Amino acid sequence: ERGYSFSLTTFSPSGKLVQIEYALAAVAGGAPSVGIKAANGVVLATEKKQKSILYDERSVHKVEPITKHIGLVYSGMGPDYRVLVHRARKLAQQYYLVYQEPIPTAQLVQRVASVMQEYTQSGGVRPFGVSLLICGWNEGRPYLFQSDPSGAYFAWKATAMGKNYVNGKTFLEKRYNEDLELEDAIHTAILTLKESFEGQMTEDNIEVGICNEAGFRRLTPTEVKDYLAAI
């Protein structure tokens, strides 16, 4: 029963790998994240883990830029997220040096997923316990990808991950529309986050980033306050 639960390089008699399921379980117990791909833009939102007045508000961030046109967010464990972010930045710089043009979003997702697939087929290591949401603008067309702890990636129109993500996906299915604007996408993302906050939502405990034809940027707290007041 438990003989096949401890080793990463051991198949179960039914042909299953259990440590990967447990890494996904680690991912599913993290803070919620939301991504919505609208017309002419993409939005990423997340819930902060430093909910106190003692924590400094400009030290560590969960929404990060990789290039001028690529951004990132996660659910799971932060220490793995940092090293993955550093490697992604280096890969993008290498691609620019070799080909003299910015890397496409899909190629970067493929390279990161290739790095993540390793650590699931060797003994003496453990997989990364983190999932990523990747957004980008390329050739006048927005993108939104998700990458798993096992190294598999998907292309989405709207998704949620973290705690209470099944109800979030149901909410998105009910609310998502094809012909949507970026402002309405931001409104819908904040409303989706609000469904499971368990507290009072302010601009000091959520983080929002957007991507459009001008590049990726992270919203300032005053803009988030203005958006929250409009609800």
Add this chain to the structure above:
Amino acid sequence: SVYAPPVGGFSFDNCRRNAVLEADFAKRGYKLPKVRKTGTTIAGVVYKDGIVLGADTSKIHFISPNIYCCGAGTAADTDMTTQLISSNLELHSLSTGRLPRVVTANRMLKQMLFRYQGYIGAALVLGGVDVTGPHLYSIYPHGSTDKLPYVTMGSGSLAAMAVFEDKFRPDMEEEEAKNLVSEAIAAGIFNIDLCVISKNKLDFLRPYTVPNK
């Protein structure tokens, strides 16, 4: 061995054959392709609020929103060195969240040029502005650097140093600094590209963001 995994970097698989071939062609009297070289005049000064770089005609390379470079020698070498240093500085700024410092670029360029024992062959004039003020350097192909208030390189170097040692004063304004650089460049050649970096056009308190490029 043939079973060893491959590695990256430069390749040295044609040196002996190339030496024999150039010897034979020189003895018999035939020509071979050559590299492209640039030897025009480059100059730069330090004034009260920034740096002014000049060249005669781009030839002024981008390193950072606050750092620029001018090169003389083999064109491919200068291009490759400047691009590599620019990428490294962008990685550094993304990690740190701040605009870089001129001494960091000077250190990286000097170390990388010294690593290759002068075979790269790029002479550079580096200048920029950071939180500690404006700085100006001169880097040589073997890896030696000088910190000076005014530098020049190229073909008409002496005709520019004459003007500099004749009409240079500390703490000048922008306009006459540009004029002095223009005269110094024009003296050597006997149509000029100028780059001006000012501390008042840069914000050192705002968090760093990737430039348009």
Add this chain to the structure above:
Amino acid sequence: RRYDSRTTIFSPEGRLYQVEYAMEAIGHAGTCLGILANDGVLLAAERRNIHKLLDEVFFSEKIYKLNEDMACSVAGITSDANVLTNELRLIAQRYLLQYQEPIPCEQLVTALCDIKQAYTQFGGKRPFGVSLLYIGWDKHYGFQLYQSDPSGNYGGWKATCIGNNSAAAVSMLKQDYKEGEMTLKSALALAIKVLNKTMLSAEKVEIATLTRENGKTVIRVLKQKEVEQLIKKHEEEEAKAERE
């Protein structure tokens, strides 16, 4: 038990249990089908990634192009299939660079199966849980169709199926396949019938064909209109047959 914890252990009757457990991972994946005819080869797959909030930004899923003359389909673990497909492309390009001729179809399969066998031979690693179907054309044997499994075995076929509910599909193909007297249209109809039995809408299947025109190989992926036409033709002929 005591003999099924590593890939480098033989059971007292000479069995490797970890390899069999790895091959057990292919029965959960989607169905893949392959049919050989006189003037082309066929590949039909089942789409598992079906959902309203999914995007379509790629050439296709579970069908990949390896070079100018070959294509493949996968079933199993996606992250391992990605590595295997990249390695296949590298092997083909290396052979072309060295010999200035395109690689034969069987040599590519052999070269990948060697890699798959090494990971069962050496300890501390995990075998790939991937099974592949290959189609192609070359000047030595013409149209071809191969199959591969996690242990590193392969073989040539005229019609085969991998994935979920493979045995029933194999039985139907054995019953309905005519050797040496089938064309691309007959192969398409048979594939539609077999998939309909084993699993129907145009959004749940993907079909690719290979053919030769003017001394050049053409690889295509069928469209929604053509798939719907095939489905409705099958439905109408089935209704006509059952009405009598």
Add this chain to the structure above:
Amino acid sequence: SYDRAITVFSPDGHLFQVEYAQEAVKKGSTAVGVRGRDIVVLGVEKKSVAKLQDERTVRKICALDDNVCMAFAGLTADARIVINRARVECQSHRLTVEDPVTVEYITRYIASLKQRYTQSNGRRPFGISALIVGFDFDGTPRLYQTDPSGTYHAWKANAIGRGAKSVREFLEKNYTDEAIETDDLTIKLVIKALLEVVQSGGKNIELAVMRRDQSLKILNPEEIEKYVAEIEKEKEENEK
């Protein structure tokens, strides 16, 4: 309880993992080899035939060089790896030195490669056994056998695989100097030896023939059925 590791001896001096690899060998299809005055014959049983399969890709007889060929019993991927290594070695040796490769030399190379994989706990042995035949430079026929442990011997007629003991006993009874006088008699002897365990003759029997200074020849079903018919006719005549 001393069979969990490759390099562990039992209290009475046995290595059990190598014996388990031999057990894996003992479950393959039967293979028979006979060497004669001027000919060597190899025959392999076909376990089952699927109608929707291309039979060219599942053959158990290969050609390592122009003067040597091999048959095997056991796991198939391991056999393919060993065959490729031996072929590359033959090509490299022929390129380096123009002399033809010796059958004993290639047998020793294969046995050394097999024996290398029974020395460490980080890798497992090859679960195959091979039969090697060929002609030397002077035209002397040879026949060798290899084992998963790394040993090898020389024979006049041998069988490996499932149901090998009965075939070996039949060969011991029937192998005489007047039964290998001619190529047809040698081929008939091989077919008759294979017919002890094969359910239906000709239908699922594969046979190869090699003559001196000639390439390897694979007999077709027509010739196989003709030989089987001749055997049936002589059996009917001897019935009485």
Add this chain to the structure above:
Amino acid sequence: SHPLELSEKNFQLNQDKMNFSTLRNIQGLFAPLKLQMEFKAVQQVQRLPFLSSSNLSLDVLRGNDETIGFEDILNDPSQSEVMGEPHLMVEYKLGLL
């Protein structure tokens, strides 16, 4: 051949020797010992040598995760133009050849 061939071949080894000597002189015998233990431990979890590895942990430990050199953009080892047989390369890695 060229004077730069040997220098570029063994750059990392010479850098390691210099840093280890300086560290031993300044702090003591324990610091290079710990560094070598860590390097050996992290350099042991990789793909089989005929496939392409990433060396993420080794780059994190060594500090090469925010630097790009000429060995990262020229003659990319991932798209190598020659590769041996898998078993032969694995055997050569273990010293059997």
Add this chain to the structure above:
Amino acid sequence: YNGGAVMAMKGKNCVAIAADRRDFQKIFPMGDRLYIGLAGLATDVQTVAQRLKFRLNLYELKEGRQIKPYTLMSMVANLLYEKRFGPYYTEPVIAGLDPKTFKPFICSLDLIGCPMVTDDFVVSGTCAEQMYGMCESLWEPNMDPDHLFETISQAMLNAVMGVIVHIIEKDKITTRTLKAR
């Protein structure tokens, strides 16, 4: 020892590349409506062509699209700068059209990969200091394919035994062999 000469000219929605024939191949096709011409040592030309084809095939399989002339120039520059200390004896010339816009492009590189992009013409080969002034004298903008072929043929011919010219259009590619009377 002979290295030959290669030129490329640009006109109105068209581009041409020419070389001298009679002995080896110098102009190679890299995809549709994109060519590269190499002049120099016989073995280095073929080696560079084969390695470039290797890289181009891998790139096009992985990316899923057709390459652009600028990206091809960057790849050639990287491949040439790899051998910085012992270099290849080649001087590439690139001419082609944009696969999605159909806009002409011409450039040339040195033996280590320093590019030069122009708008009228570009010349390579050992005798690169003689066709220059003739090219300025005989070139004017907004030139139809027939006059473009005539101009490039004249410039390639009356400056030095036969020549070969490719004319690239959005619809078709025309190849001609010439010999002075």
Add this chain to the structure above:
Amino acid sequence: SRGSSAGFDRHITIFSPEGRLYQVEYAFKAINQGGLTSVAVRGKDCAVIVTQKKVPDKLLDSSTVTHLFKITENIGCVMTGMTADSRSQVQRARYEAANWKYKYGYEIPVDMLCKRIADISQVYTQNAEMRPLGCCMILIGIDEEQGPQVYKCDPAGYYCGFKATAAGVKQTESTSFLEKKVKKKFDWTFEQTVETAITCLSTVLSIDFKPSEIEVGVVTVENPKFRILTEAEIDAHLVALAE
């Protein structure tokens, strides 16, 4: 090597069915093995660190017992947890600062040093051969453009910046006290910061302090060098609280 141990809480590289790392959680419990607590507070133009000093043996030289360390000329530190592990991390931090100075030509910042240490700590939690250190670090310094800085890293590889923080046996009560004080008032002078830190310690631990039982280090804008106070200064501050 030796070989891992079966079980959901006996090896570093094994996830539990809920996705937890019990060896990391157990390494977090080694910080309380010492029995001491420390407090760091950030002011308007200064930063202080305070920790308690326990000398139970009469035959022990009290001048050799300390938990305050100097990394560079402008960076200070306080360590909580296992003593040998703390000293090893201090040595590693000094080495990393030296490498940064050599490589970049200027002195390392506090956040960059903390990030480097956290990156090194993350690797120990993903490999089967090495084990995490049972200690936590708190760093203070003065930034040229930003000002006072307070940073902390833990055995898991996680780091953050604070306005006030605590570590040790009684971290939670200190955190509550500091949260109340910060929500009440800001803009503390140099005197008020030391007052607040000593008051937090002396209220969380119901003790009236002597100058020989606490250890105080400070950094300030006027004098950006890390400094360690003396008994006379500590007693002056203590009587200032007492009056």
